[PDB]
Amino acid sequence: SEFELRSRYFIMLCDNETAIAHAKKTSIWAVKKDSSKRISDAYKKASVYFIFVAQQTYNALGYAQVVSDLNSTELPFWSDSSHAGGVRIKWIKTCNLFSAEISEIVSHMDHGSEARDGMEMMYDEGSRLCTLIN
Numbered sequence: 001s002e003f004e005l006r007s008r009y010f011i012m013l014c015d016n017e018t019a020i021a022h023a024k025k026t027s028i029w030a031v032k033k034d035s036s037k038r039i040s041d042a043y044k045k046a047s048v049y050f051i052f053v054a055q056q057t058y059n060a061l062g063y064a065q066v067v068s069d070l071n072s073t074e075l076p077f078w079s080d081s082s083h084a085g086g087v088r089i090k091w092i093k094t095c096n097l098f099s100a101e102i103s104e105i106v107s108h109m110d111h112g113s114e115a116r117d118g119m120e121m122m123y124d125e126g127s128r129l130c131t132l133i134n
Contacts, residue, residue: 009126
């Protein structure tokens with residue numbers, strides 16, 4: 001890649017139409033409090049990608065590089081008390097793609113059960129998902 005080290009990858013389960021549509025236009029995402037510390041820690045040590053999939057269906061909506069650390073005062077309008085702060089993103093792919101393999105990876109991402117929003121995935125999973133979304 002353009003990077004020295006492997007990237008780290010996080011899943012964003014999208015259940016808010018305004019949010020995802022706005023993020024594709026403004027290149028900012030609101031990071032949930034449960035997952036923010038891990039994401040911020042990761043951003044300090046590695047290139048970080050967010051992989052965005054639709055909740056339940058697991059259609060792939062795109063993937064983006066995270067290009068700023070968590071900022072408690074730079075948040076999109078649609079954020080709420082569930083969020084810690086905002087991060088800027090750089091979209092690599094934007095799409096609306098159903099793939100059985102994408103869905104299977106997301107369905108088994110948490111020790112063989114369905115992905116938890118904001119979780120870090122394994123390298124094999126993130127790299128495969130970005131390959132499938134390219």
